Design brief:
Chain lengths: 19, 75, 75, 19
């Protein structure tokens, strides 16, 4: 679904600097 | 038939004691103990990568004090 | 023994078709079908109130297009 | 715990205007 993919993108983005 | 909306929220940090030899599933199983989310409904992320259940933390360079991200995955 | 952090995330909206006569548990059961969270690990909130499992949506004036909030509750 | 109570407070706060 669209919400889940947009959230996935947001969290992948976040993990780039929060690891 | 009535229509309602449910907005889901989770924004918390949890600490796990794990082993480098542990699989992402064994991590997902420790997580399930804390938060009750079935492992097949957890998407674990680290440093831009989605983590695969059969592979180990050592395979992703997950080390002491690494921050993993957990996304709830609907069914 | 290795220490890691897991940051949990959920920020999504779900639509439920329910009945005013339904209990908060029956709502929690519909939710569990979508997101896999056990009902005893869901804290449902509406308009500043925490909702009780044995009481009905009608008891809280939950109506068509009401927005409930779901907080994940650890164990 | 402290995190859960602070999140509970945040979401109750939010639901006051998002209902
Ligand atoms: Na971001
Ligand atoms: Na708020």
């Amino acid at each position: 679904g669209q919400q889940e993919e947009e959230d996935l993108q947001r969290i992948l983005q976040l993990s780039l600097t929060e690891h | 038939a009535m229509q309602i909306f449910v907005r889901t929220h989770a924004m918390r940090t949890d600490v796990l004691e794990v082993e480098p030899s542990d699989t992402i599933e064994n991590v997902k199983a420790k997580i399930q103990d804390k938060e009750g989310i079935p492992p097949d409904q957890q998407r674990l992320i680290f440093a831009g990568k989605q983590l695969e259940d059969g592979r180990t933390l050592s395979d992703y360079n997950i080390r002491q004090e690494s921050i993993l991200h957990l996304l709830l995955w609907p069914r």
